[PDB]
Write an enzyme that holds these catalytic residues in place. Structure first.
Site, PDB file in Angstrom:
ATOM      1  N   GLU A   1       0.794  -1.244   0.000  1.00 56.83           N
ATOM      2  CA  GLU A   1       0.000   0.000   0.000  1.00 56.83           C
ATOM      3  C   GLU A   1       0.813   1.274   0.000  1.00 56.83           C
ATOM      4  O   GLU A   1       0.290   2.341  -0.306  1.00 56.83           O
ATOM      5  CB  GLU A   1      -0.830   0.011   1.302  1.00 56.83           C
TER       6      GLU A   1
ATOM      7  N   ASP B   1      -6.764   6.488  -4.519  1.00 62.90           N
ATOM      8  CA  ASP B   1      -6.259   5.164  -4.684  1.00 62.90           C
ATOM      9  C   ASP B   1      -6.370   4.672  -6.137  1.00 62.90           C
ATOM     10  O   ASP B   1      -6.719   5.420  -6.998  1.00 62.90           O
ATOM     11  CB  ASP B   1      -6.828   4.198  -3.632  1.00 62.90           C
TER      12      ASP B   1
END
Ligand SMILES: [Cl-]
Ligand SMILES: [Cl-]
EC number: 3.2.1.17
Length: 164
Positions: free
Chosen positions: A11, A20
């Site tokens: 991540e 994202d």
């Protein structure tokens, strides 16, 4: 290697609100803020999560705190899920981390479409499971990450994460 180091690799770490892979406002170590298109709404959710007026920016400690909470929640979520629990209990420690990673990324909702794959994992049919896991939107959208998790389920080792 452990679940925390594994997800930190997958991540990344960002201290300002960002979008994202699906275009949703996120911060820290993959902490989804909201699926809403509104930056204001995202800033509001951020302030609510941190407990202060952040102005869309947090510190490293704050990010790590969100992370710790998020991993704990994923684990707890698996333990409470009737379909996932049995699978999780059947796996060895490495493989469990792979299941946590999926849940952290896609939630119980996403992991729900993986019924058939979960059944193969429970059966310990590793290669078969790896092939089934790849026939998914998840794999086509985030192939590099999916390949890492799939290899983890296939081999039961952290080999895909060594070097990163
Ligand atoms: Cl929160
Ligand atoms: Cl990817």
């Amino acid at each position: 290697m452990n679940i925390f180091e594994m997800l930190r690799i997958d991540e990344g770490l960002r201290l300002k609100i960002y979008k994202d892979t699906e275009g949703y406002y996120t911060i820290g170590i993959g902490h989804l803020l909201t699926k809403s298109p509104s930056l204001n709404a995202a800033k509001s959710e951020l302030d609510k999560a941190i407990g202060r007026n952040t102005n869309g920016v947090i510190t490293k400690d704050e990010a790590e705190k969100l992370f710790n909470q998020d991993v704990d929640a994923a684990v707890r979520g698996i333990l409470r899920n009737a379909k996932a629990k049995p699978v999780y209990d059947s796996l060895d420690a490495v493989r469990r981390a792979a299941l946590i990673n999926m849940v952290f990324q896609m939630g119980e909702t996403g992991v729900a479409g993986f019924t058939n794959s979960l059944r193969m994992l429970q059966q310990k049919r590793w290669d078969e499971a790896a092939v089934n896991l790849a026939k998914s939107r998840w794999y086509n959208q985030t192939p590099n990450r999916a390949k890492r998790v799939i290899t983890t389920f296939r081999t039961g080792t952290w080999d895909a994460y060594k070097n990163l």
